[PDB]
Design a binder for this molecule. Structure first.
Ligand SMILES: Cc1cn([C@H]2C[C@H](O)[C@@H](COP(=O)(O)OP(=O)(O)O[C@H]3O[C@H](C)[C@H](O)[C@H](N)[C@H]3O)O2)c(=O)[nH]c1=O
Ligand SMILES: Cc1cn([C@H]2C[C@H](O)[C@@H](COP(=O)(O)OP(=O)(O)O[C@H]3O[C@H](C)[C@H](O)[C@H](N)[C@H]3O)O2)c(=O)[nH]c1=O
Ligand SMILES: Cc1cn([C@H]2C[C@H](O)[C@@H](COP(=O)(O)OP(=O)(O)O[C@H]3O[C@H](C)[C@H](O)[C@H](N)[C@H]3O)O2)c(=O)[nH]c1=O
Ligand SMILES: Cc1cn([C@H]2C[C@H](O)[C@@H](COP(=O)(O)OP(=O)(O)O[C@H]3O[C@H](C)[C@H](O)[C@H](N)[C@H]3O)O2)c(=O)[nH]c1=O
Ligand SMILES: Nc1nc(=O)c2c([nH]1)NC[C@@H](CNc1ccc(C(=O)N[C@@H](CCC(=O)O)C(=O)O)cc1)N2C=O
Ligand SMILES: Nc1nc(=O)c2c([nH]1)NC[C@@H](CNc1ccc(C(=O)N[C@@H](CCC(=O)O)C(=O)O)cc1)N2C=O
Ligand SMILES: [Cl-]
Ligand SMILES: [Cl-]
Ligand SMILES: [K+]
Ligand SMILES: [K+]
Ligand code: NA
Ligand code: NA
Ligand code: NA
Ligand code: NA
Ligand code: NA
Ligand code: NA
Lengths: 397, 397
């Protein structure tokens, strides 16, 4: 068989990796999205990956003429018409529990509409928008403080899994379909949200305002901004101003308080930059007071730097352990795949203090992971001839 | 006690009637809505009613200065501020299951949002929009072909009941409250729907388009109009045009067929006028073919004339019985309260054929009802000196 993987991001990358590890005899090809210019971001560039792993990249046009192929769209950006192929072995992963939420912005809309869950759906491509028969789908609940970013990461992940579970069946042809019901079918278009002129409607209830805030929270693209302040989460108060919804009751460095249709809301200014800086050398105590929401402890900057990555690079041992106690991953990575252990090794090197490593190993620090270049911490130390640190790190299980 | 009834429509009228029948010693006052100019429509004018029943009509301003009073808002149109009263005995009926759907157009929005149910809520007035503590509420399911009109009539009815059930408790002061949750609180404003420039979004799924159609179906105000055709219901087909959503696939006297995001839809032109005319003298068979949806058999024109009222006035006996077999009320009334029996008596008079009456009585025709003027069929025949018909009608139980 030939297998054509058209799309982008960690879903296209991780499915392709699994195929490589698991299916030989398959002849792989890649079609990439138009805005994929080779740059890794909060997601990997699938184009860069394919070039490095020698997966031939072809045009959508070339894809039409391949016979004895399977075509699989993973967040692909161009319309695929099944009449342009000799076969009907054409599949898509859609980021919703179809028939609901066909179309665009499916990381926002379920939140805006205050859904209790969402899902991912594997289905056949037909001529229209997310309309072809369903092969498989899985659902999952939305968290109370779900954001568009957290939702999107759940899609990437569940999408990847649902594809890998179904791949053998698509390749063999031994899978079932069910036509999508008309009932409960919904669709949003490109025009349904203007991200370049985002307005929060403040003539709304506290809950509705917060749902809009959280729907529009996706740091790599934007934070919601109100009265010139970037907002990162908030809360519903018990007070109820008599003033008109939208009235600013309080504005300072820390927060905005607004009158709504029902209960006043408190909206936290974003202090993520201040948090990262604090993680360099302040105590867990200092950080717990600086933060307004514990969600900020799992945020990452444009490089993929999280609080734990800062604490590790600066050898701030108390903050590392505290963050872990709040459910932060001790083996967190930046966007190049560089791990906590890699950062903490740098601190060991620069400082000459090796005494903290044991603690971290005990907390589950993994020395054997590899970055996106396929190198471990050991490959780095060998390469840079840091042999005494290599050997000290090598004693640990 | 004094009891001030502020509002409009059959809810304000029927609550006031119950008070009159059931509570003496209460001193009643009325405050009316600004657009209530004394005219009965698909709802009674509360102003006309109060004038005829000698309920003194006062200004909202006068209402503030009444001591030892209770104030009850039933679809009232001006904002009520509890700080303007000596007491806090101030209640409202809202047409939703609060905390959801505060604000406007609550006969549309639950339909647009494809809710499975709605309700009515009795609560205290506080300073804001539909935000005060809840005294009582009842919920009910939305029908699959619910329209804004059918929904609205359910509100009028359930509202009326919930008020009558609770009145003694409000008068005594022996009732409980519960503060409205923030969670699941929603609000729509005046601006959320422009009824003077209504657009149906056709770049949507079949189901979404039909939900918008039905949400905007309220004959006294408007029918949805697409491509210059008034629409009265429709259906989802099994075909799926490849053409773009909104493409008109077929247009004739009977219907529009449109391409959507998923399944084609068939939208019925309104033929209500043609149906009423048919009921004058055509068969049940003829009418069953003329209609495109059985919903059209329960529609009424600006006078309150329904199909059964036409068949009765014209003595079309087969159509009367058939309509009854489809669940039409044999004691239907127009908007002046004039009943089927009143219309059928006219036919008896004009034609001299008395032979059908027995059948109708057997089907449950009620000769003892009174119109809005408080007259029965017998009061009319006495008045007009139609004594042989009076006496023939009088033999029936
Ligand atoms: C463009 C943009 C997106 N978002 C959020 C909401 C989106 O659901 C999420 C993903 O962005 P996105 O550009 O991938 O667009 P989406 O609209 O999510 O996905 C569509 O486009 C993809 C290329 C696929 O064809 C997919 N099948 C489509 O549904 O990020 C922002 O918060 N701000 C933004 O400015
Ligand atoms: C996290 C952090 C990093 N840095 C430095 C370290 C890097 O030299 C530079 C870019 O960071 P980065 O996350 O993009 O680094 P990467 O290129 O992913 O990883 C390199 O740097 C690590 C420290 C390890 O040595 C690893 N073996 C290297 O491949 O910024 C800071 O100065 N302050 C910081 O707080
Ligand atoms: C004005 C209008 C209303 N409608 C429908 C939807 C509405 O829910 C329903 C009732 O009309 P409406 O003018 O009573 O306005 P609503 O918006 O339903 O009710 C508000 O105004 C009332 C006076 C009360 O203050 C009530 N508490 C408010 O919620 O009729 C139309 O279909 N076309 C229309 O043009
Ligand atoms: C239903 C119907 C009524 N009419 C006439 C009868 C009335 O004279 C006029 C207005 O109708 P309407 O529903 O407003 O009448 P109403 O004023 O409600 O009722 C009067 O007319 C009835 C027939 C009874 O005599 C009753 N006792 C009267 O009070 O239209 C028709 O010509 N064709 C019809 O199909
Ligand atoms: N047949 C098919 N259906 C899909 O839903 C789909 C594919 N193919 N392929 C990948 C991706 C592409 N999705 C899209 C969706 C809409 C437009 C589009 O042109 N959208 C405009 C209308 C026209 C315009 O932009 O000029 C819009 O308003 O949304 C382009 C690509 N997609 C599934 O993910
Ligand atoms: N305190 C109180 N709350 C209510 O929700 C309420 C009452 N009173 N009294 C009766 C009725 C009146 N409702 C309303 C609601 C809004 C406006 C209003 O002015 N609305 C505009 C904003 C201002 C404007 O029109 O200039 C809007 O955008 O909706 C007037 C009367 N109503 C419950 O039924
Ligand atoms: Cl090194
Ligand atoms: Cl008479
Ligand atoms: K307020
Ligand atoms: K279509
Ligand atoms: Na299947
Ligand atoms: Na947009
Ligand atoms: Na060295
Ligand atoms: Na109560
Ligand atoms: Na409006
Ligand atoms: Na006479």
């Amino acid at each position: 068989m030939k297998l054509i993987i058209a799309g982008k991001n960690n879903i296209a990358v991780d499915v392709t990796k699994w195929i490589i590890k698991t299916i030989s005899d398959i002849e792989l090809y890649s079609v990439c999205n138009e805005n994929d210019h080779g740059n890794d971001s909060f997601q990997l560039s699938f184009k860069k990956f394919c070039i490095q792993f020698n997966i031939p990249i072809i045009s959508l046009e070339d894809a039409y003429h391949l016979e004895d192929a399977i075509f699989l769209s993973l967040e692909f950006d161009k319309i695929i018409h099944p009449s342009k192929f000799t076969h009907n072995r054409i599949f898509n992963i859609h980021f919703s529990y179809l028939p609901a939420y066909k179309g665009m912005y499916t990381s926002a809309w379920p939140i805006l509409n205050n859904e209790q869950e969402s899902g991912v759906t594997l289905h056949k491509i037909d001529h229209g928008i997310d309309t072809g028969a369903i092969i498989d789908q899985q659902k999952f609940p939305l968290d109370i403080e779900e954001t568009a970013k957290t939702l999107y990461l759940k899609y990437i992940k569940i999408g990847t899994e649902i594809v890998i579970k179904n791949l053998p069946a698509l390749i063999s042809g031994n899978y079932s379909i069910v036509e999508q019901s008309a009932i409960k079918s919904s669709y949003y278009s490109k025009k349904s949200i203007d991200y370049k002129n985002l307005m929060i409607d403040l003539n709304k209830t506290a809950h509705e305002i917060l749902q809009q805030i959280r729907a529009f929270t996706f740091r790599d693209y934007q934070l919601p901004r109100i009265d010139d302040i970037d907002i990162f989460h908030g809360e519903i108060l018990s007070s109820k101003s008599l003033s008109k919804p939208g009235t600013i009751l309080e504005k300072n460095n820390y927060h905005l308080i607004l009158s709504t249709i029902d209960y006043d809301i408190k909206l936290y200014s974003d202090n993520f930059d201040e948090i990262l800086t604090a993680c360099e050398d302040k105590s867990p105590e200092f950080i717990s007071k600086l933060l307004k929401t514990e969600n900020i402890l799992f945020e990452k900057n444009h490089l993929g730097w999280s609080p734990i990555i800062i604490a590790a690079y600066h050898g701030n041992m108390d903050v590392i352990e505290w963050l872990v106690s709040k459910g932060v991953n001790i083996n967190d990575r930046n966007y190049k795949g560089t791990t906590v252990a890699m950062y903490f090794k740098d601190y060991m090197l620069r400082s000459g203090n090796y005494t903290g490593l044991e603690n971290l190993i005990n907390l589950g620090l993994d020395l054997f992971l590899k970055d996106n270049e396929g190198l471990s911490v050991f490959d780095y130390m060998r390469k840079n001839k840091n042999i005494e640190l290599f050997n000290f790190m090598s004693t640990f299980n």
